[PDB]
Amino acid sequence: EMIPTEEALRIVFGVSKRLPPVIVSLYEALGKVLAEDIRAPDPLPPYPASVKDGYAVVASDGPGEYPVITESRAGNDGLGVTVTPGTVAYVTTGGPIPDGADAVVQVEDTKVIGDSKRVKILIQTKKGTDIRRVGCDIEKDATVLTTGERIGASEIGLLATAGVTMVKVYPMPIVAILSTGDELVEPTAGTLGRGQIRDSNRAMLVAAVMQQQCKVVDLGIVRDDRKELEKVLDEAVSSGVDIILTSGGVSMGDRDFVKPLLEEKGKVYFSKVLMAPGKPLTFAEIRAKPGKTVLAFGLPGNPVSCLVCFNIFVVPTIRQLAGWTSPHPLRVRLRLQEPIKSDPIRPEFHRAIIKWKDNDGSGTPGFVAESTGHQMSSRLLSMRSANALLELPATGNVLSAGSSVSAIIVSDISAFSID
Amino acid sequence: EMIPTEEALRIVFGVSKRLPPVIVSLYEALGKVLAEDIRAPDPLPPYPASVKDGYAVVASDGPGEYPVITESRAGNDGLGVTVTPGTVAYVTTGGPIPDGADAVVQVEDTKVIGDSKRVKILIQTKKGTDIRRVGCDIEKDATVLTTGERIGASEIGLLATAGVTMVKVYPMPIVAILSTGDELVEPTAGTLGRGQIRDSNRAMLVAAVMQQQCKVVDLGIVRDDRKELEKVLDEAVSSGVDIILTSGGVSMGDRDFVKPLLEEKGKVYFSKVLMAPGKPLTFAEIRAKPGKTVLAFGLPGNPVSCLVCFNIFVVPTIRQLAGWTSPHPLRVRLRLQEPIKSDPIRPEFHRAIIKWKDNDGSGTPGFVAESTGHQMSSRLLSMRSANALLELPATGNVLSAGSSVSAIIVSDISAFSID
Ligand SMILES: Nc1ncnc2c1ncn2[C@@H]1O[C@H](COP(=O)(O)O)[C@@H](O)[C@H]1O
Ligand SMILES: Nc1ncnc2c1ncn2[C@@H]1O[C@H](COP(=O)(O)O)[C@@H](O)[C@H]1O
Ligand code: MOO
Ligand code: MOO
Ligand SMILES: [Mg+2]
Ligand SMILES: [Mg+2]
């Protein structure tokens, strides 16, 4: 009944569907994937523009003293004026080139003469120098952005260039989160009573979903009572969320009602994965009453297993729903800074702190990994500062320091601390 | 008057000061750097906890049939009951181990006997098996998080474990943004008049600052009038922001008032950097009237130069103000997928799309880079999809395909599209 992670991932990918596109404002489009192509309605620059502060000249005139017949910085400056041979115009960078001028001489290659305005051009320039012709940066009707492209700051800049302030994008999924267990108390609890622990998974998962830029619906702690969990799941399913995340209540306990309830409400595709940590992971698809599908992840209760399963299975599902064409995490190859013993049955997602070094140990640059120590699934300190999961195959052998392994990068690579 | 980028960066680092710490709620602490150590007020688990669903036994009893004297899942279950030799207790994962039991036998190694409750233990277990002793995951008073540590989802989980819902952190800086130019129109403009372009830098910088998780104060378009820009800068300086970003008005134009105004209001440390793109970058420190310092970046107007300067100089300043101990960007080494001509004077921050390959061209894994094409500073399409800036030294020689270069990673490495 235990499936490999690669098959569990394929199943999730095959069930997960891109959400219907929506229209958002400019700053709401940041971080989203475009659901339409964007075409420039006019060229950039829309007028021949100076690259420099200086003088617009007729290049064939060459060096000499000339009257300054207009000044062109913006708008209608120099409208109706023709720079004829034997004249020049002052220009600032981005200023429209007056008719008749065919090159710009930067101010450093000129000198103002006299105490009316006259200037000495100190060089022989070439036709077209320091002029941006109409549309040289962006041609009118060119496609500046395409469908399936994620919007970052430069793409916001291109949308603003093209005058697009309402954008068609794929939305982020809305995610409901709950915790299960009679042992749980809220994390505001002070002195714990006997047999109680603070609910850490819910806040951890709320934060994890906030890092994925999705809206969170926090459904709180649910006790180990089948009727109660059914009511919360029925309410989560009908609320309009796209994903439901539960943690706990999915092992072999006599009060673990997540799996049987997901079996009753929808289709469970799997409930056990061959992996360390994260064995009791359940995945289901539930149809909400009319009109849409809801994906449910019955995450394991052990804090480490909970976050690892979120990182490996939930993040790519969020990205797929959000229209990402490349939802898979970044996988790199790296060298171990210390020896690690692999398990003989379950492949391990071993937590590590990775960094780029000029010498990775082999004499050339590369990533290196330090284990976070003891990997027990109950030990959330093993996730502390972990920016990667080393994919250790189930060989049972000690992988020595300096051996090469594959690693899944789980936290912003541009936020990596340097060596 | 033109300083190397490394010196411009050192100056910015030496002037930039970490902001005073603040107290925020749990979910507000996400993405922030801790400004206090966090100690566990109680152990995890606070009671001896079962690792499995099954039966708590006296290990020395060994295999046999035994009465089930209590059931322990949470809270006060089994309080006052002693598991004596010849008895067992039912336990669920995370359930408190009753007094007297010293090992757990998972339910798969047991069988319920009879139609009162009796169970057959099918194995010989060892003392301490499948029990988490008090504090084995986290010891009472252990430091679970330290000052200078950035808070991600696992660190939120550790704060919730320790019952911390109000956290001392370094805040993010508040950033004011404005654009300058008589040629600019709002990006809502439809048909452009002569000599007008849409303001793209402001939205681009607003988005860039939003990606850095800072609050934005949008000060709009300012015209090329010294008195007007002075009023907006005086108002930005006195508003409570920590950083002011302007773009444009910093080249050699006769109406470029950013540098002289920053010289008049504060201390300009530099106004020209030896780099391609981004030559006219100005940096100043202004004291606000009582009581604090404001950092001002006079960013270049050319869209590419504007974003590149933001990425290289502003991002690490934001991170330093926000208490990051490693504010520098991730720098990797990679192989070029195509030839690139380097400039003979100015070192270039060449935009590229980088990806990790199993074969980088040299036969071993590594990053490879594709140029985004023409690198003119007016061409914002050169930033499109650019996740890195290749640091090309000023040699004037053609760096062929397959040569190794240093690259600054500018966009989330965990958001990288795979090969
Ligand atoms: N929300 C939670 N936060 C912290 N630990 C949890 C949470 N839910 C379950 N656990 C623990 O995870 C383990 C497995 O839980 P379960 O799958 O409900 O048996 C037990 O040790 C639970 O006490
Ligand atoms: N906000 C803006 N958005 C787009 N282009 C700009 C902006 N500000 C300045 N520019 C252009 O950048 C170049 C340099 O501007 P400046 O430094 O003001 O001379 C000129 O081509 C300007 O038209
Ligand atoms: O059963 Mo696990 O893989 O320790 O959550
Ligand atoms: O003067 Mo630049 O380096 O094209 O902004
Ligand atoms: Mg439970
Ligand atoms: Mg200007």
Curated annotation (Swiss-Prot), chains A, B:
Q: Where is this region: MPT Mo-transferase?
A: 5-416
Instruction: Name the gene behind this protein.
Output: CNX1
Looking at the keywords, is Membrane present?
Answer: no
Where the shown chain sits in the full protein? 15 to 442 of 670
Instruction: Describe its partners and assembly state.
Output: The G domain: homotrimer or homohexamer. The E domain: homodimer.
Positions in coiled-coil regions: none
Describe how its activity is regulated. Answer: Inhibited by copper and tungsten.
| The protein's name | Molybdopterin biosynthesis protein CNX1
- Per the similarity annotation, which family is this? In the N-terminal section; belongs to the MoaB/Mog family.
Q: Which GO terms describe its molecular function?
A: ATP binding; molybdenum ion binding; molybdopterin adenylyltransferase activity; molybdopterin molybdotransferase activity; nitrate reductase activity
